[PDB]
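Ticket #4471: complex job returned nothing on first submit. Input attached below:
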Amino acid sequence: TEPSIWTVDDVWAFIHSLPGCQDIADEFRAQEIDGQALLLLKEDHLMSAMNIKRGPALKICARINSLKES
Amino acid sequence: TRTEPSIWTVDDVWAFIHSLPGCQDIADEFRAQEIDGQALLLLKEDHLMSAMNIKRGPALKICARINSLKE
Amino acid sequence: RTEPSIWTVDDVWAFIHSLPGCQDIADEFRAQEIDGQALLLLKEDHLMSAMNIKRGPALKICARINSLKES
Amino acid sequence: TEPSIWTVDDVWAFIHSLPGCQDIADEFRAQEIDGQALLLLKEDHLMSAMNIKRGPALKICARINSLKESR
Amino acid sequence: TRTEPSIWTVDDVWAFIHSLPGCQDIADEFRAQEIDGQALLLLKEDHLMSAMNIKRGPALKICARINSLKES
Amino acid sequence: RTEPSIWTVDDVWAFIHSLPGCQDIADEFRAQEIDGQALLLLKEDHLMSAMNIKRGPALKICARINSLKES
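Support reply: We reran it on our side without changes. The output follows.
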């Protein structure tokens, strides 16, 4: 349940639950992004570094901020 | 369907931005970046003014229309 | 003899160009396509940070915009 | 002689004459602060957007205030 | 750091990366490119992804644990 | 004598060779006729990727060239 111990499969389901983020979810899994790597992600990482369109990148970034409970 | 902007599709955002003065090219960019209504509401002032390759003028207008959209 | 909110991009250029020492930076407003609407949406932080504008003109521009809004 | 009609060079000499403000005078000149822009400076402006150390920023503020004062 | 990272051998670095979660396999690439403790500290965030063809997941955690290692 | 910009191909080799784990790479530098002039023209891309050289020694060579450029 705690995101810090989430696995790559867990993070996949997380991103795949987001609207229109079901394709990047696979790219999140392909790059072996577990719960730790997910929390290490910065806003710049998403777009320019991970080749992700701003739309999905915004929603993913926002959902991550929700896990950290603001 | 529903009138709320939070469930706007990628197309709805385009039509919203494309209808704005001098923002007809920017809408195409918005559409290309798959910016739907949910993402449109997540945009920050820094995102428009600086982040992406958008002229400040239209960026100021788009920003202001999103702010007014939230009430 | 015209309300600033309906000022075109060129109307704004001539406005900024008329300001002291702001003749060169007036082209940047036009380059950024700042019409009368986008002109009135500009904040003090927007001038230098978002548009590279030197602090000199930025102070004079911001001041004259406030007088334009009549404060 | 009147601050309002001072040029960028006149402002440079003014700041340069202040103790330990020599290098900052160069920044003023680079940022094209004329007499008008100099009088438009707020206390916050000195070290918020201009990145002046508090020390010389205090002296500059003080001399600008002495300018607006007796005059 | 009883063993200063600067004098870490190529094999000392392999064991370091191997101890990181999910970086057990990627550790072998650090050993392959002959990255000692000296090179490990010269690495930058961009170096991980592009230069060594490292997956982003491990690369993020490797980058983070190095920054925590440098706090000494 | 020993001045980086005027180094010969041999001077570079002896320089690269003295570095830990960069012994075989020094021989590659020889074969590519890299004198001190060409050594100072090398970029990070040239070391890491552009040629088959292990990143470890490539990083250390980069750093030592960077330290060599500080005066």
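Chains F and A do not touch (no CB pair under 8 Å). Closing as resolved unless it happens again.
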